[PDB]
# Entry
Amino acid sequence: GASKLRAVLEKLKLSRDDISTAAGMVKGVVDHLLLRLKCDSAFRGVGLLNTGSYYEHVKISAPNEFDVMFKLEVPRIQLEEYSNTRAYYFVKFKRNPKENPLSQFLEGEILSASKMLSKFRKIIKEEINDIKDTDVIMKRKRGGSPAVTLLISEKISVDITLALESKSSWPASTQEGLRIQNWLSAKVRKQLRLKPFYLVPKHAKEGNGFQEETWRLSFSHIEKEILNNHGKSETCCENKEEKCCRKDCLKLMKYLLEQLKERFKDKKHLDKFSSYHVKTAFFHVCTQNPQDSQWDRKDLGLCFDNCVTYFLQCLRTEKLENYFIPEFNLFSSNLIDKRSKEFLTKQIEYERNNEFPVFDEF
Amino acid sequence: RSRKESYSVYVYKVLKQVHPDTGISSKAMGIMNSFVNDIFERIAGEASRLAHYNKRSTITSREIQTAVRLLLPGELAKHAVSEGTKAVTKYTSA
Amino acid sequence: SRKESYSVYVYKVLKQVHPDTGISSKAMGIMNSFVNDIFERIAGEASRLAHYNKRSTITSREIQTAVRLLLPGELAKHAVSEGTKAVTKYTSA
Amino acid sequence: KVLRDNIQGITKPAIRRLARRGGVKRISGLIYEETRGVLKVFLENVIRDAVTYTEHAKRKTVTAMDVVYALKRQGRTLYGFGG
Amino acid sequence: LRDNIQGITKPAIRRLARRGGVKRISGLIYEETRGVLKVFLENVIRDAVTYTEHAKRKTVTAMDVVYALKRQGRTLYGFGG
Amino acid sequence: PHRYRPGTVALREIRRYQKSTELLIRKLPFQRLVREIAQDFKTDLRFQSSAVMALQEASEAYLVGLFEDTNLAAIHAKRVTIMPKDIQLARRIRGE
Amino acid sequence: PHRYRPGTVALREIRRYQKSTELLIRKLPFQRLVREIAQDFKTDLRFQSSAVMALQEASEAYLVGLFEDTNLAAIHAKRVTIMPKDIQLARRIRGE
Amino acid sequence: RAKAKSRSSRAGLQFPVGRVHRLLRKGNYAERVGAGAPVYMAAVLEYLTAEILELAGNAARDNKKTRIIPRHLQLAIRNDEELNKLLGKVTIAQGGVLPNIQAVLLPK
Amino acid sequence: RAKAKSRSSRAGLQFPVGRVHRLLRKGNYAERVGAGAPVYMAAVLEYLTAEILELAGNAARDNKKTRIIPRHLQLAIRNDEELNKLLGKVTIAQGGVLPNIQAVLLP
DNA sequence: ATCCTGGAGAATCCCGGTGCCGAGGCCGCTCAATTGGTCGTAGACAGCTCTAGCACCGCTTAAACGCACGTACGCGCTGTCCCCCGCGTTTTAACCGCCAAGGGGATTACTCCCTAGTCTCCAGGCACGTGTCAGATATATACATCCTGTGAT
DNA sequence: ATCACAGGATGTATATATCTGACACGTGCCTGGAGACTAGGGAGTAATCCCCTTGGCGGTTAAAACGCGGGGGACAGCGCGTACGTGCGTTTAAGCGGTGCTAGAGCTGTCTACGACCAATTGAGCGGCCTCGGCACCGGGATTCTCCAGGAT
Ligand SMILES: [Zn+2]
# Structure
């Protein structure tokens, strides 16, 4: 079952040999924006999260779609859980003698996601008009996760996420998360938890409206670290004797969902599903299968099939726990409707029974 | 072989609320004990004086509150007042 | 009501040193502030010494030690000499 | 019932006289402004404590003792106004 | 015991100076520095002795040193208190 | 046009002001400054005349002592004229 | 025969000594200094090892603080090198 | 007799109340100690304790540690202006100093 | 019934003893105050009082007066290192300052 | 440019008298000191345990000591300039004395109620014991900062 | 003659593996916290008395504010030379650890001289009163300063 998958993986990799220039264009725009933000009193401390890189591709089948995060330090914050959601919080500031320059975004006691996002978009919009060799257009808002979507010439899109950084003990809701103890080790878990966590502007939306000024917890940096340090051996994959298919399985899982979403993007059934769900499911399967020998590259076929099966089980039962926040169900009926899950279930089951033809067809 | 009192046990607990995953050295603990006794004495000392100055035999929550304001700077004093005011408000309501 | 001060005692001491010298009301007010300031300090240290050594009583010994900790140079010494005598005599009186 | 700008009530000659008493012979023009910026801080800290004591006692009128205690605890003492 | 002030080595003085942000040290500093350290020690030690003697002891304890330092506007943390 | 040279009067005034004991800051001006500051903590405050004097003497004593240290800093720099930074240094060394 | 220029090492050392926490004065030397002073007040006196350490830490903290003020005075005088005067001025301003 | 309950728990505090109630009596701070005094104070001591430990913990994390040592307490206290002053005369055993180097001493 | 007799007389003091005893036992210094403590203290306060007044009286004559004023107290204290130290942080109302002029300011 | 009288021109000291209000001495009285007796417990004292502070020994080795080179720094000298000082004239409001109004501090009398002091009982917290993980140590590799030559400009 | 660059040299930060002893957690007391109770003194409240703060007026007077001219100090720039910094090689005694001794801290138990406490008596000290004497202020004269001119260096 691995041979067809290997051909797919090779195809997906080769499509990225062309990117070096695209990454260049993204960098040009990003550096430009950061200069303006640094000139702005509110964003003076802003910088890239994925330090050393101007590109990250969240979607495996979208090589022309870039994702960058602009982080902003908040030296001390008090979180207040929004409506028992375990992932959404109001951000307030603690006692701080010196002037805190983010005061301009406050609304009463609470840091306004709306104000910060509004100004973030404002600064960028005025600033992109100062990009002269490259045409950069700001797209209309569709949410707060990407604070800004930029359209660069006719080839490049950049999703920009603004995040607050907090270098303090992770919230209690994360206490039982990051369940890598039996996979990457308990000591690695502890090391990772000495790192900061992030907060992204995000309204806490419900069926009857939304809470405007909430922020959601983000551990994207840890997710990256795990994927690139997925072994308990660590140099797993730096040598053939330890070549595993974890990374391959994730690309294929992401690719399966992305291909199906692309296939049916017009019927809208799959709009609420994302690579983050796939990636979360993947980490759970890795947790269930902590030994590198359960991911032998030779078993790509069955490893991927088993990954698919787990994802299907999550869809059918409407349950996918956030890897860092176990009480946060990414697949709750409140976030994703059953119709979408039944549709995806059937499409995946069709694909799996036919050796995943959607992988070749476009 | 004498029971010796300290705040080591209480300091640990506070540490857990602010930083659940961290510990503290025996020296840092010794320092925190010196710290608590220093602040305690000052507040109790000033509260004593306020009671004396205003011709009283009793220290109440006010002498403590006023003592806090005089001893602590800026907002630090304020938050201490807010927390104290509350703890009493609740204590007498519980 | 009726205040209390050391004005009467300070006045007498002035005569012991300078029988023909008078004193202003302000100088007297200053001397009163002085006496109360020194008193408080010595009493303060004596309190502490008793506490430090786990005792309830202040005796002439705590006062003596307090004097040394507070007074510089020979003032501490001459004060101790005078204190020692006053107690020695009072006791035998 | 609102007071303002009485910081300039501390006139140039007044500053100089204080400086001269301190043995200062010659004074740069920028001293007048800098000096007031220090006097004021001193007063804010002392007055505030005096007010704090006054409020504790539930009074309105600040007395000499309220000021003396306020000064005292800041690392000094003032003789002649009570005790 | 005698002249143990010379036990405070030159490097020892410089290192303290460096920690204070001092980049260059005049050759006459070493003696001047000692003349200050010694005075500091005399005042602190004497108070510690005074407390020790009051208590009718011969051994000076950390608590006697702490009390001695304290009253000079110097609370020291980490040795009881 | 008979007159004294620069520095002759200044030294003289130093002698005289060191010698006398009265207040050098005018009273009503000072008194108002106290109140202007006080009103920022609370309105409708009142002062006894003895409270105002207590504040004034402490305030002058403070500034005079500050000037003594300021003067030394200027001398250390090999000067006669005091500048804002001689004040700042003196305060910083004190620990303010 | 590679060399670092004057001031390169000194700045390096400043960084490091500011960073670390250990005692900079040798112990047995210091310990004896304490005792020599002590014997001038009283013979046959003893110390706990913790008493000696308490003195040493306080002593260094004092000197470091003194050097910081000394350094500022030298800068005020537009110098890098600290001289006995800079120590004396700082102490005086502090009330010693 | 009714079941006994700790007062610290009742007031929502971690610091002992009964103990403070007692200590406030000695050194004769006052002849008497009011019922709400021990509580008010315990809350204050706890608040300040938390501020120092939290900031020190942050320093420990910056240095990639899992605990607070005397140094972290020093860095936290001094960087925080209000705590700096409250403890402005305190010498911390093994505190070290802040890495402040005067600009005039640096080459360029 | 023995006649009442001032303790100050017994101790050869001018300062009150019974009053000092009273002040010591309260003002919250200790639970208890020994009989000899008030006496020891009264003698100390008296000694220091005499030193200041004596020196102030001398200062009064430098100004050719027969009286002590706040200024004479200031001059008495600051021209005596030990008193100056004891009271080194004391501000005395209407004390003025010593007439100290730096040599570098002079012709 | 700098020293040495000798005069002119203020400024500061000393002399003698006015007059005033603040010190200093006297009288009433009242309540804080003194006396005298009782109770109980804090402190003095002796005895004993055994922690920990002193003294000594030898070995390892990182710090301290002394010297030589040379150059960045401190110091003194010169000249520019501008910015304080000192004087005189005009302008302001501080100070003084007097008046009236009333707000709030100080004292009084009275009454609970909120604490201290007592006894009983149990669980929260400290001294000890044990196991293993965090940080220290040490090894070795790779990146960052500093300082001379040197060739390009 | 200056800029910057590249190379070397050096020192720092980095990952790695191993060691160990200092923390974190558990056990078993045991004595201090908490509950339950009475007794009574302090704090709270309101009456109300009258002292002192506030506000306002008008006159006068010294004190501030303003402007001008000119000397004198602050400052920048230069050059000398020496007093520190840096690196090398030799000498020192600090630090480690291990041993052995006993002096003095720390705790126990006993007993009694000392001080809190209470009730009675009274005279030392505080408030209010008058008296007049040392000090502050006025005006005049003596002499002791500073500064410039003119004649020496
Ligand atoms: Zn792998």
Q: What stands out?
A: The pocket of zinc ion is lined by residues A 230-231, 236-237, 244, 246 (CB under 6 Å). The two ends of chain G are 47 Å apart (CA to CA).
